[PDB]
Design an enzyme around this catalytic site. Structure first.
Site, PDB file in Angstrom:
ATOM      1  N   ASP A 135      13.166   8.168 -40.817  1.00 58.08           N
ATOM      2  CA  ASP A 135      13.057   9.609 -40.666  1.00 58.08           C
ATOM      3  C   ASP A 135      13.515  10.267 -41.958  1.00 58.08           C
ATOM      4  O   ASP A 135      14.182   9.651 -42.792  1.00 58.08           O
ATOM      5  CB  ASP A 135      13.898  10.129 -39.480  1.00 58.08           C
ATOM      6  CG  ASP A 135      13.276  11.351 -38.797  1.00 58.08           C
ATOM      7  OD1 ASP A 135      12.426  12.041 -39.430  1.00 58.08           O
ATOM      8  OD2 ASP A 135      13.642  11.617 -37.623  1.00 58.08           O
ATOM      9  N   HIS A 154       2.477  12.365 -33.651  1.00 61.32           N
ATOM     10  CA  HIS A 154       3.534  13.357 -33.826  1.00 61.32           C
ATOM     11  C   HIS A 154       3.410  14.092 -35.153  1.00 61.32           C
ATOM     12  O   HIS A 154       3.365  15.327 -35.183  1.00 61.32           O
ATOM     13  CB  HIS A 154       4.917  12.705 -33.712  1.00 61.32           C
ATOM     14  CG  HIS A 154       6.041  13.679 -33.914  1.00 61.32           C
ATOM     15  ND1 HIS A 154       6.167  14.826 -33.161  1.00 61.32           N
ATOM     16  CD2 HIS A 154       7.071  13.691 -34.791  1.00 61.32           C
ATOM     17  CE1 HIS A 154       7.239  15.493 -33.550  1.00 61.32           C
ATOM     18  NE2 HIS A 154       7.802  14.827 -34.539  1.00 61.32           N
TER      19      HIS A 154
END
Ligand code: HEM
Length: 445
Positions: free
Chosen positions: A165, A301
């Site tokens: 991330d 996403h």
């Protein structure tokens, strides 16, 4: 861009192993303002400080204020953000969730701000909390707190589901040297009153940003078992086929390799290379953009939160569409690592997840827009075939129902999955992170 005056977490993050989100109310404005100017303002970490490894502090501190917190300080100026002024609780229905499931503290407007404490040991954070509480006395009052930590070892920089991330951020024109494929935006998309922010701000607020905080619980064993149970039939090991379903939900492999550039197997070398891992637009010069989901599902996403060429613009990198809907992300995981008992039973018992932190100059253009108009929108992105993209499988919400997500299975872009929520919102709040000069200036006056 006056980097000296901008709080560090907005543009570069705290760069610390541990973080504490300390949500407070202001009981005595006069005493609070006294220690805000004398005790907090000198220690607030700036972008300049946190940019250099040399000048990183032992405990990095940032602070942000809710609308009711600014009012409590006697600040009645219009900040130019209707969503900020009403509070995130009155905004929950825009995301098809209910404040009835929220942490009781967030389900109101009683919280006046958040202190973000960052350090490499929790001992140092515990010391600073005692120090802050002893100098403010009862003029500050802790209503809630959330402890958070970078994950251990090789999972550091990964979130609780296992995915690297912090890869994709907007580059600010005139500040960052843009990486291949990264969006390039005017400073005023992130920083209030900066270049090309069209909203008039109070002068003391120039150099700040709106902080959207969300406590997002993740059901990691549940997610891991859903992937194995619904993995697409095919060649490799079952685990490999399960990882591929997960990578198609996110749009990236756990290494960070984007599926748009490597749609059938992971490539950890690419995932780790910032010169390559964002160099894509979703357009593929031999395929039709409106119907090809063989590289990346329309519902993935990252594709729902940054559509790139789904919203036009350059078909070759860098795509620059919808720069005004960029957010800076500074979130960090919370809770314990998944235990043996949970891993063996495929069931969560210990609450864990992400402390989601998004910075934007306009809440209606950033977090709120991404969540409601893109991720929660079954017909976004537009112009696709089939037109029903479905919901974001990571963050998409529909009032607690399982969510219908299309295009995830590579063999058949029409096959639908009904996916239970693996991310559960416990709520949060909208804050304003002021420029450092306002902290001991206007906010202390
Ligand atoms: C627990 C909840 C969440 C998880 C596990 C999660 C996970 C991820 C992951 C793994 C990535 C790829 C890594 C990267 O691009 O740096 C990513 C990117 C991103 N996420 Fe999420 N996320 C969550 C919540 C949210 C929410 C609520 C929003 C906005 C409403 C959001 C917006 C974004 C954006 C804008 C990107 C960058 C997309 C791009 O520039 O290509 N995330 N997220």
């Amino acid at each position: 861009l006056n980097t000296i005056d901008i709080q560090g977490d907005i543009l570069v993050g705290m760069h610390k192993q541990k973080q504490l989100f300390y949500f407070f109310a202001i009981n005595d404005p006069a005493t609070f303002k006294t220690h805000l100017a004398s005790d907090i303002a000198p220690v607030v970490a700036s972008v300049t400080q946190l940019s250099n490894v040399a000048t990183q502090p032992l405990v990095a501190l940032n602070i942000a204020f809710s609308n009711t917190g600014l009012l409590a300080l006697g600040v009645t100026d219009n900040l130019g953000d209707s969503l900020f002024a009403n509070g995130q609780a009155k905004d929950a229905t825009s995301f098809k969730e209910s404040t009835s499931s929220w942490v009781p503290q967030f389900a109101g407007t009683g919280i006046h701000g958040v202190i973000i404490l960052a350090s490499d040991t929790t001992d140092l954070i515990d010391q600073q909390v005692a120090s802050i509480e002893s100098t403010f006395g009862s003029s500050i009052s802790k209503l809630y707190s959330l402890s958070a930590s970078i994950r251990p070892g090789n999972e550091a920089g990964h979130e609780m589901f296992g995915f690297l991330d912090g890869i994709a951020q907007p580059a600010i024109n005139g500040f960052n040297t843009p990486l291949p494929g990264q969006n390039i935006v005017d400073a005023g998309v992130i920083i209030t009153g900066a270049t090309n922010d069209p909203i008039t701000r109070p002068s003391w607020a120039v150099g700040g940003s709106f902080l959207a905080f969300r406590q997002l619980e993740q059901l990691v064993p549940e997610f891991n078992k859903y992937l194995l149970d619904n993995a697409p039939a095919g060649s490799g090991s079952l685990q490999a086929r399960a990882d591929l379903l997960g990578a198609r939900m996110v749009g990236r492999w756990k290494s960070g390799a984007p599926i748009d550039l490597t749609p059938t197997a992971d490539d950890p070398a690419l995932g780790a290379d910032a010169q390559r891992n964002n160099n894509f637009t979703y357009s593929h010069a031999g395929f039709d953009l409106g119907s090809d989901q063989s590289h990346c599902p329309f519902s993935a996403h990252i594709r729902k939160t940054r559509p790139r060429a789904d919203l036009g613009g350059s078909l070759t990198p860098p795509n620059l569409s919808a720069g005004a809907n960029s957010i800076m992300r500074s979130g960090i995981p919370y809770g314990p690592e998944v235990t043996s008992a949970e891993s063996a039973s495929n069931t969560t018992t210990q609450e864990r997840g992400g402390a989601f932190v998004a910075y934007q100059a306009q809440l209606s253009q950033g977090f709120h827009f991404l969540q409601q108009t893109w991720a929660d929108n079954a017909n976004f992105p537009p112009g696709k075939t089939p037109a029903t993209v479905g919901l974001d499988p990571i963050i998409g919400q529909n009032n607690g129902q399982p969510r219908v997500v299309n295009g995830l299975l590579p063999s058949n872009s029409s096959a639908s999955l009904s996916i239970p929520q693996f991310v559960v919102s416990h709520g949060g709040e909208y804050f304003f992170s002021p420029p450092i000069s306002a902290i001991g200036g206007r906010l202390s006056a």
